[PDB]
């Protein structure tokens, strides 16, 4: 048993039918020593007496909020959650495996730029008594501070959650040597699970689409601009672009190109970091004519 947060504890269990579970000793958080009784959740049935209570934790009926009392008054609360270990593997019931870029990928993160801000999302089918908690750092042995916001619903189609984080002391121009770590606690009823992702910002970069795509006729000159959210100065954080008619494609480092509107009209442009192979932006498109 270890403390997750104030008055909240996690009990790790080898999980299989008729498993004996783990013995735990709870201590009432009080200076008092006499006249204490214990209960669980809503029931008033006294489960035990004394400063401490010994319980066998082997199923979800043994988890929940244990409360000690004296003189009719509540002294403290202790919430016990279960972390299932199934065949030496911690359970991943709560989140859906996205299986990309590899097996056991539950969290996906993206950054629009090198600012040190990024967004992560995960998926679950569960709608019930569901709480997530997100913490982050750069490095594990000597962690540097990262602040995240609250995780909240961002879409329903399968429920998608998102959270925003920002490195406290970012260096957009530096060569990262320690990866960002993202850690997600997930609680469903009394079932505790947790998840992790490790990455360099540079590997999760995906620029916003090209801005203000315009056409100039010539007896069909294409031009566009860097996206507003991209890192500055553009002379340092250079982009490269792919221009497609639809395959009729050209690649350029300029913000303009000349093409021929053969088919019924489709022209599309997308952007990538010029110097490091991260993700392409979504396409920007404008019809010909």
């Amino acid at each position: 048993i270890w403390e997750l947060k104030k008055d909240v504890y996690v009990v790790e269990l080898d999980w299989y039918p008729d498993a004996p579970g783990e013995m735990v000793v709870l201590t009432c958080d009080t200076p008092e020593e006499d006249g204490i009784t214990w209960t669980l959740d809503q029931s008033s049935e006294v489960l035990g007496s004394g400063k401490t209570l010994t319980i066998q934790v082997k199923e979800f009926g043994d988890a929940g909020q244990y409360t000690c009392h004296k003189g009719g008054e509540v002294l403290s609360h202790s919430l016990l959650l279960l972390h299932k270990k199934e065949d030496g593997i911690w359970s991943t019931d709560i989140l859906k495996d996205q299986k990309e870029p590899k097996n056991k990928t539950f969290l996906r993160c993206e950054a629009k730029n090198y600012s040190g801000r990024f967004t992560c999302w995960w998926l679950t089918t569960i709608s019930t008594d569901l709480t997530f908690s997100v913490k982050s750092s750069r490095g594990s042995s000597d962690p540097q501070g990262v602040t995240c916001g609250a995780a909240t619903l961002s879409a329903e189609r399968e429920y998608e959650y998102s959270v925003e984080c920002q490195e406290d002391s970012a260096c957009p121009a530096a060569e990262e040597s320690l990866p960002i770590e993202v850690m997600v606690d997930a609680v469903h009823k009394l079932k505790y699970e947790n998840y992790t992702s490790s990455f360099f910002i540079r590997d999760i970069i995906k620029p916003d689409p090209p801005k203000n795509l315009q056409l100039k006729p010539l007896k069909v000159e294409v031009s566009w601009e860097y996206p507003d959210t991209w890192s500055t100065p553009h002379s340092y954080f250079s982009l490269t672009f792919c221009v497609q008619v639809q395959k009729d494609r050209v690649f350029t480092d300029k913000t303009s190109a000349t093409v021929i509107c053969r088919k019924n009209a489709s022209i599309s442009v997308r952007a990538q970091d010029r110097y490091y192979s991260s993700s392409w932006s979504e396409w920007a498109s404008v019809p010909c004519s």
Binding site: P101, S177, Y236
Partner: protein, 162 residues
């Protein structure tokens, strides 16, 4: 001055070769528990080394000393037993051209009068062929990150400091 426009071309070419010279893995593959400690012995363009746009305007010598150091380090590595040992790569291989591009760029940065060549801390490479192969992937993706920063520095200097 450091002949910015020649450094842009050679550093840009390095980015192309760094990705094309050798097979790649995914950014989450070949990760392992000891990677956190191993990273400290390799040099990086860190916070405060002067390679941010503001640092380059104030005094580009700091950044260029660091970039040169990193190129020399990766050169020594690409010429070491890690890459020349079994399974052997020939000098005319794509990696050999990549090694030559590191050497070509590093010769350009070292001004006249200043001496930035140091001594390597070679240590000892692995002895099993499979472990050599894994380390090549890890080294080259570390190089990809380094040369991307270098290419931005030289692109920015040619555009604003020439």
């Amino acid at each position: 001055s450091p002949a910015w426009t020649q450094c842009q071309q050679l550093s840009q070419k390095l980015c192309t070769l760094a990705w094309s010279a050798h097979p790649l893995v995914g950014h989450m593959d070949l990760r392992e528990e000891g990677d956190e400690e191993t990273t400290n012995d390799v040099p990086h363009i860190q916070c405060g080394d002067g390679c941010d746009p503001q640092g380059l305007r104030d005094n580009s010598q700091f950044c260029l000393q660091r970039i040169h150091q990193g190129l020399i380090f990766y050169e020594k590595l690409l010429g070491s037993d890690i890459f020349t040992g079994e399974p052997s790569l020939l000098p005319d291989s794509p990696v050999g051209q990549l090694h030559a591009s590191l050497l070509g760029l590093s010769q350009l940065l070292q001004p006249e009068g200043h001496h930035w060549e140091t001594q390597q801390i070679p240590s000892l490479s692995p002895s099993q062929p499979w472990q050599r192969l894994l380390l090549r992937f890890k080294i080259l993706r570390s190089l990809q990150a380094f040369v991307a920063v270098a290419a931005r520095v030289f692109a920015h200097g040619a555009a604003t400091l020439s």
